[PDB]
Amino acid sequence: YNITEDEILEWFGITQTAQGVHLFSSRYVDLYGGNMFQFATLPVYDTIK
Amino acid sequence: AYQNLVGYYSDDGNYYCLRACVSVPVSVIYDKETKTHATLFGSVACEHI
Amino acid sequence: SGTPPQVYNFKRLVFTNCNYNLTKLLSLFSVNDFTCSQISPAAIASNCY
Amino acid sequence: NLTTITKPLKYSYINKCSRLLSDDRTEVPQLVNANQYSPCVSIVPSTVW
Amino acid sequence: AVNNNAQALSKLASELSNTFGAISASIGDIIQRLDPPEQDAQIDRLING
Numbered sequence A: 001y002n003i004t005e006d007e008i009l010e011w012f013g014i015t016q017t018a019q020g021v022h023l024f025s026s027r028y029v030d031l032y033g034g035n036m037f038q039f040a041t042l043p044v045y046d047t048i049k
Numbered sequence B: 001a002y003q004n005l006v007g008y009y010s011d012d013g014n015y016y017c018l019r020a021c022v023s024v025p026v027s028v029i030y031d032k033e034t035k036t037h038a039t040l041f042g043s044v045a046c047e048h049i
Numbered sequence C: 001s002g003t004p005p006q007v008y009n010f011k012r013l014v015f016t017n018c019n020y021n022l023t024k025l026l027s028l029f030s031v032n033d034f035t036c037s038q039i040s041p042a043a044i045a046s047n048c049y
Numbered sequence D: 001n002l003t004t005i006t007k008p009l010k011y012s013y014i015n016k017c018s019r020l021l022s023d024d025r026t027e028v029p030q031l032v033n034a035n036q037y038s039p040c041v042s043i044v045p046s047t048v049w
Numbered sequence E: 001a002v003n004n005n006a007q008a009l010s011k012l013a014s015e016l017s018n019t020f021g022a023i024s025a026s027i028g029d030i031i032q033r034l035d036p037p038e039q040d041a042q043i044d045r046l047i048n049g
């Protein structure tokens, strides 16, 4: 994943569903600010403990 | 708030709204002992034929 | 393709933002049994998700 | 008229799966959740001989 | 009193969203996505509600 460089606080988010692992960033949408939007889906075999 | 799709961002980048397929509700006026009746379309100008 | 693995070692294929066609997929299947709970067997052929 | 696909060795499933505690006197039966994987998947190889 | 009339109307405008134990609040989606014999029961449940 190619992202830009800055000095702005941001947010990183890890979660999972039966679809697989879902990875979230705030850089893609609310880079001027702070939210949490979906940007990656990961085809895992099993849930992480 | 009522879980209805208010609007939509189309593939041309043009945002749109969608409300309903509103059709005119009709009432009927009827007279006993003089077999006469008539129809009323409320809240609408004389446009529906 | 490949080898169908065991029931406790099932392989899951996930699909998001693509196109399916069971007309060209279910035809090449020798289906012994076709059950669909909380859904019709024809719903997966037509309705989009 | 479809031979390109392969076939596994034999069908196999897990008839008993359990967790044994540290005391080795209390037994916990296992339950698999909706679209999840049992812990006994980590201990059973690809084929049961 | 004005808010009482407004919430009385919002009672009607809101309870269509409630499934009343059904799986979907759209009757057309119910009759499209389901087979007749169980969609009859689901429609009957939502009609009762």
Ligand SMILES: *[C@@H]1O[C@H](CO)[C@@H](O[C@@H]2O[C@H](CO)[C@@H](O[C@@H]3O[C@H](CO[C@H]4O[C@H](CO)[C@@H](O)[C@H](O)[C@@H]4O)[C@@H](O)[C@H](O[C@H]4O[C@H](CO)[C@@H](O)[C@H](O)[C@@H]4O)[C@@H]3O)[C@H](O)[C@H]2NC(C)=O)[C@H](O)[C@H]1NC(C)=O
Binding pocket: A006, A007, A008, A009, A032, A033
């Ligand atoms: C560390 O220091 C750096 C720089 O010193 C900071 O970077 C700046 O951060 C501010 C704060 O977000 C940014 O300001 C934003 O500007 C947007 C408009 O800028 C556009 O237009 C100008 C030209 O007018 C362009 O130069 C620019 O590139 C943009 O194209 C606003 O729209 C933003 O407002 C949004 O967010 C605020 C909340 O922050 C809301 O109130 C608004 O309603 C709106 O949603 C915002 O104000 C600025 O662009 C950044 N500059 C650079 C060079 O990065 C870091 O933020 C700072 N980090 C920390 C942790 O302090």
Ligand SMILES: *[C@@H]1O[C@H](CO)[C@@H](O[C@@H]2O[C@H](CO)[C@@H](O)[C@H](O)[C@H]2NC(C)=O)[C@H](O)[C@H]1NC(C)=O
Binding pocket: D041, D042, D043
């Ligand atoms: C996961 O890794 C562990 C660690 O090696 C594996 O456990 C070994 O399993 C073999 C049998 O296949 C035993 O002979 C070893 O003694 C085990 N070692 C340990 C440290 O537990 C385990 O089999 C692996 N599981 C999978 C599914 O790959």
Ligand SMILES: *[C@@H]1O[C@H](CO)[C@@H](O)[C@H](O)[C@H]1NC(C)=O
Binding pocket: A001, A002
């Ligand atoms: C992302 O970075 C890699 C490493 O330099 C580069 O090869 C690739 O082209 C970049 N992709 C984009 C979309 O910038």
